[PDB]
Design an enzyme around this catalytic site. Structure first.
Site, PDB file in Angstrom:
ATOM      1  N   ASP B  31       0.960  -1.390  -0.213  1.00 37.66           N
ATOM      2  CA  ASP B  31       0.162   0.236  -0.050  1.00 37.66           C
ATOM      3  C   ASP B  31       0.986   1.233   0.032  1.00 37.66           C
ATOM      4  O   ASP B  31       2.220   1.156   0.364  1.00 37.66           O
ATOM      5  CB  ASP B  31      -0.930  -0.050   1.174  1.00 37.66           C
ATOM      6  CG  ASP B  31      -1.752   1.275   1.387  1.00 37.66           C
ATOM      7  OD1 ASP B  31      -2.228   1.719   0.617  1.00 37.66           O
ATOM      8  OD2 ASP B  31      -1.648   2.207   2.386  1.00 37.66           O
ATOM      9  N   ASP B  33      -0.208   4.904   0.916  1.00 32.06           N
ATOM     10  CA  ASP B  33      -0.136   6.165   2.321  1.00 32.06           C
ATOM     11  C   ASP B  33      -0.249   5.377   3.559  1.00 32.06           C
ATOM     12  O   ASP B  33      -0.807   4.509   3.670  1.00 32.06           O
ATOM     13  CB  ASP B  33      -1.533   6.659   2.260  1.00 32.06           C
ATOM     14  CG  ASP B  33      -1.491   7.700   0.817  1.00 32.06           C
ATOM     15  OD1 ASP B  33      -0.751   8.762   0.629  1.00 32.06           O
ATOM     16  OD2 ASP B  33      -2.572   7.255  -0.069  1.00 32.06           O
TER      17      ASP B  33
HETATM   18 CL   LIG Z   1      -6.091   1.854   1.269  1.00 29.76          CL
HETATM   19 MG   LIG Z   2      -2.283   3.469   3.580  1.00 30.51          MG
END
Ligand SMILES: [Cl-]
Ligand SMILES: [Mg+2]
Ligand SMILES: [Cl-]
Ligand SMILES: [Mg+2]
EC number: 3.1.3.75
Lengths: 327, 327
Positions: B31, B33
Site C-alpha cells: 500500500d 499512504d
Molecule cells: Cl487503502
Molecule cells: Mg495506507
C-alpha cells in the site's frame, strides 16, 4: 422440483452436484443476462425507453456525456448508438455507463418499465453506427430460461443458497430475479449487481441496498421512491469485481460449488478463481466465438494452475448448454 | 542496498524472505499512504491546494456535489470538511470522491503540486465539522520512510518485482513512487491506484494508463498534458478491489510473497486473501485502534480458514513496525 428443461447428461451432473452438497451451507452464483435468461435487460431497456420517449438525450445526466454525440447528416444519434461508440473506447467505460444511463428515475418507475419490457413479446428497433453507416438492428427483450428457473429453485430447496452476481444495475436485476412472477424466487438481498447511490428527493439522504444489507436494515419497499443517481458504488460487479463481490458480500474463504456464466472476460474471474475445487462450471454457450474463447481460457488456466503448483481445477466439471437446450 | 532503518528482528525476517525468493519470478505488493511513506497524499494535497486557491468549490466538478454544502452564518465549508461529511455516509462514497476531486487539471500541473507538497514539509491547517461545531486540525504532508525506500530497492535488486496498490489516484501515487527523486524507483507500470479517464482536450480521446499498459504500449510522458476527469475506471483499488487488482493486473494464480498495509478494512483483502502461504504480512502500526482491529481480523480469519478446510496462513509471518521505527 425437477431439472426437466435440461439435456439429460447435464441434468445428470447437476443432480449429482446437488445430492453431494444439500444442506451443508453451500452456495451457488449466477450471472443474470444471457445466463439465467436469454438476451440482455439493459441492452433492451435502453432502446425500449428511448423509443417510448422516456429516455432522451437531454434528460441524460451531464456526468455521462463523455464524448461528443455523432449527429452527421441531420440524424440525431440515439443513446443506444452512443453506448456502442463508448464500448469501442473500452468495456470499462461502457459497462458502468449502461447501468448509469437509467439515472433520474425512481425505482418504482423503473420497475414499471422493467415489467413492460418483460411482457413486451416482440423485438425493439434501435440504431447505431457500423463505421460511418447508420444501421438497423432489432433487440430482443429478456426471455426467462425454464431450466434456470428449475435449477434456481431446486438449489434453494436443497439448502444451497443462490446468489446473482451480474454486471448490470443491481436494482434492475433485482426487479427480475427477486419478483415471484418470473419464477426465480431469489431473495432480494442475495442479488448483487452494479450499484449507484440512491437519493431521497425530500431529505437528500444517500443510500444503497448494499449499505442497508450490511447494516442489517434492508427492506426493498422503502427504497421504491428514491431516485437512481449515477454516482458509482464499489466493487463493480464485472471481471475481477465478480470475484471481489463474492469476497465482500458472501464469504472470504468458502467457495461457490457452482458458478454460471456466458461472457468469457466478464464471467471468467468468478468461473476460474471463484468455483470450488469440485464445483460445477455452468456455461451457457450463445456465441461460437465465445465457445472458442472459453476453451482457450480452460487450456491456459489449467496450465497456469499447474505451473504455480495448484490442483488443476479449471477444466473440471463443465456443464455446457446452448440457450435452446434450456429455453 | 541495506535494511538499515528497521528494527533488527524485522530486518532479519525480511532478509530471509528476500533470500528464499531471489530471482524466482516472485513479486511484492505495497500500500502507499501510511505504509510506504508516513501520512496521506490526497488528504494533505487537498487542503494544501485549497489554501493556495488552486482548488475551490467553484472549479469542482458538478458530478461530485452529492450533497449540499453546510455553511454557517459567517464561514464557508471547506473541501476537507465536505469530504469528512461524505465519509460519514460511507467509505464507498468518500473513497472515490477524494480521488476524483483532483479533476480538471492536467497530469503536468498535478505533478507540480505533488512535488510542491512533498517539498512543503510543514503542517497544513484544515477545518471540518465535529458534530455540528466547527473544528480545526493540522494535516501533515507525506514523509518518505527510509526503511521502505530500502526494502523496495533490496527487493528489486534480488529480482523480486515490486507493485504498489493504493486507494489514492493512480496518477498521484505514480508521481511519488515512480519518480526517482524519492528513492523508491518503482516501475511506472507497476503502480496501481484508483483510475479515472484521462482526456485529450485537443481531440477528445479518452484513455487511462491501465488501458495503455494492458494494450502493450505505455509511455508516462505521453500522458502529461491529458486532463484528469472524474469518470471512474475499475477495479477500484480499495477493500476487495485490491485483491481484484492483483488478479487483473499482476497474476491470476501466483501470489505475492509480501503484502504491506496499515489500514485494516482497506488493506485486509490483499493481506489475508492475497499474501502467498509462505509470504510476509508487513504491517505499519500508526494507530492504536487499528493494531487491535487487525489482531481481531487475524484471529477471525485464522479460524475461518481452518473451518473451511484451508491451511491456516492468516497468522503467519507478521512483520509489525511503527512509523518511527522505519522513518
Ligand atoms: Cl487503502
Ligand atoms: Mg495506507
Ligand atoms: Cl457480465
Ligand atoms: Mg451474462
Amino acid at each position: 422440483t425437477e431439472l426437466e428443461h435440461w439435456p439429460a447428461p447435464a441434468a445428470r451432473q447437476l443432480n449429482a452436484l446437488i445430492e453431494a452438497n444439500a444442506n451443508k451451507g453451500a452456495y451457488a452464483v449466477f450471472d443474470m443476462d444471457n445466463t439465467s435468461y436469454r438476451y440482455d435487460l439493459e441492452e433492451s431497456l435502453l432502446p425500449y425507453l428511448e423509443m417510448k420517449g422516456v429516455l432522451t438525450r437531454d434528460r441524460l445526466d451531464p456526468s455521462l456525456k463523455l464524448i461528443p454525440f455523432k449527429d452527421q447528416a441531420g440524424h440525431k444519434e440515439s443513446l443506444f448508438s452512443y453506448y456502442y461508440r463508448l464500448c469501442e473506447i473500452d468495456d470499462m467505460v461502457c459497462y458502468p455507463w449502461v447501468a448509469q444511463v437509467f439515472s433520474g428515475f425512481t425505482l418504482r418507475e423503473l420497475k414499471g418499465y422493467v415489467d413492460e419490457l418483460m411482457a413486451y413479446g416482440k423485438p425493439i428497433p434501435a440504431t447505431y453506427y457500423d463505421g460511418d453507416k447508420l444501421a438497423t438492428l432489432d433487440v430482443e427483450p429478456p426471455r426467462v430460461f425454464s431450466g434456470q428457473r428449475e435449477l434456481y429453485n431446486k438449489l434453494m430447496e436443497n439448502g444451497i443458497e443462490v446468489y446473482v452476481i451480474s454486471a448490470a444495475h443491481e436494482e434492475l436485476v433485482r426487479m427480475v430475479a427477486a419478483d415471484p412472477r418470473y419464477g426465480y424466487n431469489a431473495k432480494p438481498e442475495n442479488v448483487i449487481g452494479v450499484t449507484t447511490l440512491l437519493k431521497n428527493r425530500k431529505t437528500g439522504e444517500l443510500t444503497t441496498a448494499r449499505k442497508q444489507i450490511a447494516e442489517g436494515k434492508y427492506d426493498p419497499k422503502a427504497n421504491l421512491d428514491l431516485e437512481v443517481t449515477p454516482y458509482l458504488w464499489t466493487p463493480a460487479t464485472w471481471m475481477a469485481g465478480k470475484q471481489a463481490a463474492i469476497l465482500t458480500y458472501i464469504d472470504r474463504w468458502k467457495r461457490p460449488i457452482l458458478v454460471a456464466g456466458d461472457t468469457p472476460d466478464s464471467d471468467g474471474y468468478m468461473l476460474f478463481n471463484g468455483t470450488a475445487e469440485n464445483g460445477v462450471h455452468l456455461w451457457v454457450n450463445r456465441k461460437a466465438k465465445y465457445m472458442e474463447q472459453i476453451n482457450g481460457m480452460i487450456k491456459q488456466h489449467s496450465a497456469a494452475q499447474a505451473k504455480a503448483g495448484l490442483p488443476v481445477t479449471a477444466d473440471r466439471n463443465w456443464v455446457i448448454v446452448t440457450p435452446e437446450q434450456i429455453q
